[PDB]
Structures are given as C-alpha cells and as structure tokens.
From a paper:
The housekeeping enzyme glucose 6-phosphate dehydrogenase (G6PD) (EC 1.1.1.49) is the first and rate-limiting enzyme of the PPP. It catalyzes the oxidation of glucose 6-phosphate (G6P) originating from glycolysis to 6-phospho-D-glucono-1,5-lactone (6PL), whereby the cofactor NADP+ is reduced to NADPH. In the present study, we describe the crystal structures of Leishmania donovani G6PD (LdG6PD), both native and complexed with one or both substrates. The LdG6PD monomer contains three domains: an N-domain (Q5-K49), the NADP+ binding “Rossmann-like” domain (residues D50-I248), and a β + α domain (residues D249-K552).
To investigate a potential function of the helical N-domain conserved in Kinetoplastida G6PDs, we generated a truncation mutant lacking the N-domain that includes residues 1–59 (LdG6PD60-562). Crystals containing only NADP(H) diffracted to a resolution up to 1.7 Å, and crystals containing G6P or G6P and NADP(H) to 3.3 Å and 2.5 Å, respectively. The crystal of the truncated mutant LdG6PD60–562 obeyed C222 symmetry with one monomer in the AU and diffracted to 1.9 Å. In contrast to the wt and LdG6PDC138S crystals, which contain the physiological dimer in the AU, the truncation mutant LdG6PD60–562 crystallized in an orthorhombic space group (C222) with one molecule in the AU. Consequently, the physiological dimer is formed by a crystallographic two-fold rotation axis. However, our usual tetramer cannot be constructed via crystallographic symmetry operations. Instead, a different tetramer is formed via C222 symmetry operations, which interestingly resembles the G6PD tetramer of related Trypanosoma species. Here, the LdG6PD dimer–dimer interface is mainly formed by salt bridges (R268, K324, R326, D335, E336, and D393), keeping the dimers in a back-to-back orientation. In accordance with these structural results and in contrast to the stable dimer-to-tetramer equilibrium of LdG6PD wt, the tetramer was no longer visible in the SEC profiles of LdG6PD60–562 but only a single peak corresponding to the dimer form of the mutant. However, the crystallographic and SEC observations were not reflected by impaired catalytic efficiency of the enzyme. Only minor conformational changes of the core domains in the crystal structure of LdG6PD60–562 confirmed this when compared to the wt.
Numbering used by the authors:
A (entry chain A), B (entry chain A): 62 to 471, 480 to 550
Write the structure that this text describes.
Amino acid sequence: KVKDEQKSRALTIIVFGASGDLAKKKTFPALFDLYCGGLLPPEVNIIGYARTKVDDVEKWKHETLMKYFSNLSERGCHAEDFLKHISYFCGAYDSVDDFKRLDAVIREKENAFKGPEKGGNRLFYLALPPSVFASVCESIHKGAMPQEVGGWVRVIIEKPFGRDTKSSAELSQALEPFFDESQLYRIDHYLGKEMVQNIITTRFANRIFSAVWNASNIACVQITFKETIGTEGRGGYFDNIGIIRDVMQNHLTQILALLAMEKPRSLDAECIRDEKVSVLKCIEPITKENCVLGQYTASADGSIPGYLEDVTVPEGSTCPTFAVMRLNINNDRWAGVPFILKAGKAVEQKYVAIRIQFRDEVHPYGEATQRNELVIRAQPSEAMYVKITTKVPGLSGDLRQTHQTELDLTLPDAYESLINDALLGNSTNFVRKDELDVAWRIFTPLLHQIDSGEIKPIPYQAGTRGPKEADEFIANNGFKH
Amino acid sequence: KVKDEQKSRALTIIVFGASGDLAKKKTFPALFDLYCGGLLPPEVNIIGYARTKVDDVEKWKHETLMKYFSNLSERGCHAEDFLKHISYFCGAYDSVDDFKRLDAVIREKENAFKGPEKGGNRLFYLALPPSVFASVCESIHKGAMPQEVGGWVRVIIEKPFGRDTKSSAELSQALEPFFDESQLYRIDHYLGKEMVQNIITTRFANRIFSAVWNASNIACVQITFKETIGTEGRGGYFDNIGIIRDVMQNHLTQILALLAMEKPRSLDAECIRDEKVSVLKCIEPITKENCVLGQYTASADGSIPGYLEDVTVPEGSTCPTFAVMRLNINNDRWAGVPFILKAGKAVEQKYVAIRIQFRDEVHPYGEATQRNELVIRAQPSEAMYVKITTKVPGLSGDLRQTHQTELDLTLPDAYESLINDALLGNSTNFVRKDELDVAWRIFTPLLHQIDSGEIKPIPYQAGTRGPKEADEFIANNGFKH
Ligand SMILES: NC(=O)C1=CN([C@@H]2O[C@H](COP(=O)(O)OP(=O)(O)OC[C@H]3O[C@@H](n4cnc5c(N)ncnc54)[C@H](OP(=O)(O)O)[C@@H]3O)[C@@H](O)[C@H]2O)C=CC1
Ligand SMILES: NC(=O)C1=CN([C@@H]2O[C@H](COP(=O)(O)OP(=O)(O)OC[C@H]3O[C@@H](n4cnc5c(N)ncnc54)[C@H](OP(=O)(O)O)[C@@H]3O)[C@@H](O)[C@H]2O)C=CC1
C-alpha cells in the first residue's frame, strides 16, 4: 500500500553536501544499489546540492561519482542510466534566493511527473557537518517545502548528534522550529532491518519467547561490537570521540532499547519508538564503577601499530578504544538483570551480536544441563539460534546423558535499507528527539568522568580480546561460560 | 555404575508360561535382540518354565523359539549361541516342591558364576494369564527367592491389570503379600524410553520450556494413538476390552502423567513415579459428556471388513473401537487446560504423538502469527519439533511478513528397552500400585456408563478419521487448526 503511493506521486531526493566524502563514497553508491534493486520509483529525480563549482556535471558524474559504484563491470548500463536521474545545483546553504531557485527547479520536475497525484515528495539528505544543519533546515523551511497540493518532506540528519546531553539538546532545539519528529530522520548507518526484525518478531509473535523475555527467566544480556581494525591512521579524528560516543551511546543503545522495550501497542513505527523511549527512561546513568576502559597498544605481530603510535594522536592521550559497561534497567521486566555493552577496536575478531543467557535449571539435572541461550548475530554474518539441553539417544541411556543442541531459527545492506525505510516513511530504526536526550543522559556523567581523568584506559595489545579486567568484569556481572 | 554391578553377580531370567504365544513370539525374541545388542551380561541364564511337556528341549529351542528371531539370516551364529543360555523346566505353578527343585537348579547355576559377588539376581517374567499371577507369586515367595548372601528379585507383571477399579485392586491386594513395589514391574510394552526422555529432559533441563509448561502459556494438549489396522479377525477378544481399556486408561494415561507432572525431587525412578501419581490424583473422573465413541464399519474400498462383520463379534455389539475424551487436571499448573486423549483403530493413518498448542499472542502481530506448538512423535517414527513465527527476509520487508518455522529438536525397540530397564532396576516407565488405582478411578465411572448403554458409539467407515463428532469435540475443546 505504501509502495503504491510512492509510485503515485513525484519524488525528489536532494543531497546537500554532494561534493563531500560521504556523498560520493557512500550515499550515491547506496542510491545506485537501491536503483539496481528496483527500490527507487521509476522517474525519481536526484539533485546534488553543494557550494563547490562544477563546470561539467556529466564529467563529475562519470569520473567522480561512478567510480564508487560497486560491481561496475556487470552494471555499466545501469550506472549510465542511473546517472541520468542525477543533476547538480551549485548553491549556498544559507541563501533564500537560491532555495527559491532550487524550489523552481524541483517544481518543474514535479509538474512533469506522468503519474496521478499532484505535487511531490521531497527527501532532503544532509551530507554536511552538523554545524551546517540549522542553516540549511532554515533555508528548506523558508523556501523549498513541498507544494501545497501534496507531498511530504523528510530530512535525513547525519551524526554526530551532539557529544553530550547539552550539545545534543542544543542541536535538537535548533532544528525543531523547522521540522517535527515525523519529518526528521536521524540515521545510524549500522542498524540493519534484519537484526531489528529478528529482535521484534521472534519475541512478540511467539508465546514461547514472549513468556521468558524478563528477569524471572534471563540471567544476563550482552550486546557486543568487535572489530579487528584499529583507527587506521585517523586516530586524530577518533581521539575527540572515543569508543563510547562512536558506537555505544548510539548504536548499541538503540539495540538495547529494542531488546528491552515493552510490547508496543501496534507494529506502527511510532508505537515502537514510544517503547524504546519508555524503557530507556528506566536506566540510571552509568557509573564509573560499572565501566572498564581499554586503549590498544601495538600487536605482537608488529603489523598493527598501537593507538599512541599514530602521528595524529596527541601525546599521552587517554581516549578509550575499548569499553565494557553494565547498564541497570529498573522496572518490573528487568530489575536485577545485568545488561552488558561491549565495544572494541583492534580486538581478536570481527563480531556483532546479542547474547541472552537464561537462568539455569539447577534442579533436577544439575551438572547434566546448563543455561539456555539465545544469540542474534549480525556480523560477520546474520545468524539467530537457541542453545538448549536435549537427551542423547541410545545407551547407557540414562536421563543424565545429555547434549547441548543448537536450534537455528533462521538484498540491500543496512544503510541502503534505512534510506529505503526513510523513503517509505518508516521511522522505526531512527532515533527520536526524546529518545536521543534520554540516551545522552544515560552516558554523559560517565563521559564527563572520563574527560576529567577519573577513569583511564587499560592497555591491551591489538589482536587480543582486550584488557583482562574486562573479562573479569563480565564474569563478575552475571555471565557464565 | 549400575551396569558394572549387573556384571558382578549371577543373573537368572525365569520365563513362566514359556510355552505360550507371548513368550515365543515376543519375549524370547526380545531377549535375543538384547543379547545381540550386548545388553545381557555374559553368563546370563534363561529358564523357561511351564506345564507343557517338552521331550526334546534342543528341538523346541531350534524349531519353535528360533523361528521367531528376527534377522535370522545374518544372526545364525548368535542365535545358536544365545540358545545355549536357555533351558526348560517342566513344572507346576502351584507346587511347593517344584519351586524347591527350581531353586536348586538356579542355585547351582548361581554358585558356578565366575564373577566376584555371591548369590544371584533373579528376574521372573509372568508370561501367563493374570488369573495365575497370585498362585505363581506365592510359589516364588515360598520357594525361589534370592539367596540370603545376595541378590534382588524382580517380577514382571503382564496386562490386563484388572478391568476396573475393583478388579484391579483385588489383583494388587492378591500380590502385595509376596512382592512390594520395588519388586513388581507392571509392563506397558508400548512406552518407549525415547519418548519419555523427550518428555522429561526437554522440559526440566531447560529454562525456556520449563517456564511455559503450564496453564498460563498452554492452550491445549492432545495425546493421540492412531492405527490403520482393525481388529484383524480377533474382534471377539477385543469386544470384552474396548479401545479405552486397550490403550487409553493405561498407555495414554501414563504419557499424560509424565507430561503433566510437577518437577521430581530428583531423576530417581521413584521420584518420577511419585510425581506421576501426584498429578493423576488431581484429575476428576471422566464424564460421559466429555467422551465421543466410535465403532468402525467397513471401508469404502471393501478391503477392510467392518467391526460387526467379524464372525467372533457378538451381534449388535456396542464396543468402541475409537474414543476421544477430555480430562481436566485441577491444580495450579493445569486448571482450565483441556487434555485430549484420542485413540482409534482403522482410521486414516498410523500415528502416535503429543501435540501441545501454546496460547496465541493476539497482539501485536494479529493475523501475521498463530499459536506456537510443540510436537513429540513416536509413530510412525520419532520426531520432536517446535513451530514458531519468524520474520521473512527481503522485501517489502514489513514486520507483518512472517513465516511459520519448524525447529527440529532431535537400538532396542520399546519392549526391549523396558526389559533392559527392569534388569537395571529402573521402574520409571512401569505403573506403580497407587498410580494404577488412581488411573482406574479416573476411567471406571465412564466405563460403567458405557457397559450400561448410556453412551453408544458412532459408526465411521474404516480408513476415515473417525466420527466427525470427534473432530467437532476436539475443535470445541481448545484446539485450533
Ligand atoms: N564516511 C563518512 O564520510 C562519514 C561521515 N558522517 C557524517 O556525514 C556528514 C558528511 O560527512 P563528510 O562528507 O565526511 O564531511 P565533509 O567534511 O566532507 O563535508 C561534506 C560537504 O559539506 C560541505 N562542507 C564542509 N564544511 C562546510 C562548512 N563549514 N560550511 C559549509 N559547507 C561545508 C562541503 O561541500 P561544499 O564546500 O561543496 O559546499 C563538503 O564537501 C557529516 O555529518 C559526517 O559527520 C557519518 C558516517 C561516516
Ligand atoms: N502377544 C500376546 O500374546 C499378548 C499377551 N499379553 C499378556 O501376556 C500374558 C501371556 O499372553 P499369552 O501368551 O498370549 O497367553 P496364553 O493363553 O498363550 O498363556 C501363556 C501360557 O500360560 C499357560 N496357561 C494358559 N492358561 C493357563 C491356566 N488356566 N492355568 C495355568 N497356565 C495357563 C499356558 O502354558 P502351560 O500350559 O504350558 O503351563 C500358556 O501357554 C497374558 O497376561 C497376556 O494378557 C500382553 C501383550 C500381547
């Protein structure tokens, strides 16, 4: 129903900052993949908008944009024909007159649309530093809103969404005069549709999983983000960010919210967003006593230079490349259950997954059983499985002769499916304004304690698991191997 | 540990009624299979005991017993060497002097045992009509008990265990002066170890299944025993028994007890038997309003003669070949949950299984989900699986695009493993004296109502599902397709 309406009205996608790194390496290639997948509607118009002068727009499309398209050998005809949908407007983000001129250009394309509904839908993409967001949103609101006869406007917001409670709220307050929460889409490129549907459907559609998704049945929950790569020579940019702002306050926290939320009143996006916010509001701010920090030194092989070795890293930096922490959710469903977030650079393997350990049934099987588990993995590939105890056929055939059995419960990438979600009006995986403020309030006191030097990272060789105090902390906070 | 002690002392197996149908067609071939499997200890002595004169015991072993052994082409050397363990005592079941003579014969074999412990273990098997049980048990107690220096005695009791509360209690009272409940083994040939371990381990070893095994989570439970065969020309013997005494009051009820029991204090056999009895005590007697009876007429193909067509069936018999019934378990775990027992001859397929339907999660998935299920099947082959709702990958990728997924949770036959259980001292799958009386009290008021004509069977063509009022009853008592 939603896709039929998508084809019934003109569509324009406006990429601000189209001259930039993100736009050419990620955003336009993602639109190309959606186009090749048949997920953009037939006469979509795509307008790059930036200050950089481009004297030859065809040359820019072919020599700059096209070289970042994947599988170009097999897709040359698609690439050439995708490029015909793309134009370039060289203009200022802060000019009323330029946005009237842009609006004229868009309306001409909209009024030529050969389908049945009038006006047009407009998706604006801010591939810009956040310091430019307020200015460009003001310009859109003044001069490039959809035609009165019809059409929605949506604006995709890039990160960072501030860097603490105060800075993030200032940015939200700067944009809310122009766009409400049905219009702003704050994107996390890494939250895939596959994982979210695994989290939501496997629990809420099923009595068996619904009934055990609580503190009476779950011993501990861990959400883990592991990478073998280090900061890859860009340690200077990472140094002002750190592992926690990088992936934990935003990416792992949204996964936690979807995992822990109460049942939504319906499967509508904003009902799910309401439940994300409601469960995050039950989390007290993380304490320094519940956080172990790491910072990676060079690998034993020598092939991974340590973090401090980077020329761009300020001498004696204490910025964390690794963190494990415990969050307490204080409500009926979760009180007493440890929620462990772990994220690390330059560790022993690449791996992103949820691991839920259920409480052991000590009686009557004793050592012939162990905790059941549920695992939802996204990297290095999708998997979802349950581990349980089953009988062993044959003999001596004692009831105590048991085995651990794995039950397996189980295309655009995550970024492409989120752009598609935005085009289809599905805000589920995007962070809402209230949701964002609650998440910053969970993490900012800890971040202030880190910036004050109250906590300092433990070194770990690149390629190891991380500091061994981290595994100690995990073992002391509910997890059993 | 138990098997090591089995090899440490002499063992004698005494088959009373060894001249009979059961002994030659089933019991001795089952001992042969256990011998071929390595489950009998090396110098086991087997003594057939009966009144029938046998002038040539080697001829009887080779021409009568051996022809019922399975796979005889591939096992000729095993069969010949198994037969050397077998002797025959022609004697009376009611003679003190004969049992002194039998005891002498057994003691000579026991005292020649080359292992470390003295005396010997004695398993007596009553392959006799139950009218002879009290006499032979009296003779054993008087004259053939194990030697004082060491050894247990066990006695396997064949069915029928009475035919109502009063007759069954009279038989129990007749045997209890001679053997207690650690010594009597009342055998149900059809209760396999594989199914029982599936019932017990899958639930009690696992938090996930333990937590949902109750009325808060289960909508209905059905236990089903289906056969395509009819009474096979022996309708006269079946006519005095009926489908309920045949398989429901005994076989399906023990499965129900294992399914519904509370957690046993340990995995010890008598702890499980205690819980079987305790849950059966919570069942009120079955009412005629909760029972649909059937009796099969001839198949449409003609190849299955109807039940009344049998020459041996009394004219105008109302004996049921089919029954569906609802049992109510009135305790905290099960109050309000329908338990449906179904058993039928000459129906559309051969099938024995447990089907547990969990309560639907109406919200939020609505018609995009359905009741989860757990199925434990024994016939026509073992299987155990769970049915749940999962996401469908790809697009349009709506949360409401779901699929029903089957999770698969998964050698002597059932009779052979029960003889082995008896030899190893494991009474789990055998009906205890108190257990039996409670089960007869659940069924006898209904059986009296049937014998009075208060309920009469509905005809159904052989090869169909049974009377359609039966499927109506099932649908009206909690089950949804
Ligand atoms: N892979 C990436 O690059 C990642 C970046 N992001 C976020 O996406 C957004 C874009 O990232 P990225 O492309 O790397 O950033 P850039 O520094 O490359 O800026 C993108 C474009 O924005 C314009 N721009 C830069 N600075 C200013 C300024 N002071 N005033 C006006 N315009 C400016 C420039 O275009 P012009 O001069 O032509 O107007 C520039 O080409 C950022 O918010 C970033 O934090 C998130 C995921 C990863
Ligand atoms: N497949 C089967 O046969 C099934 C039978 N059962 C039960 O197993 C037991 C044996 O069954 P089955 O072999 O068919 O029964 P039978 O009628 O064949 O009797 C078995 C032996 O017991 C002796 N016997 C029979 N009647 C008497 C009597 N009045 N007094 C003394 N001895 C008697 C006879 O041996 P002798 O004259 O040499 O002493 C007979 O050969 C029964 O309890 C039966 O209900 C359960 C499963 C299926």
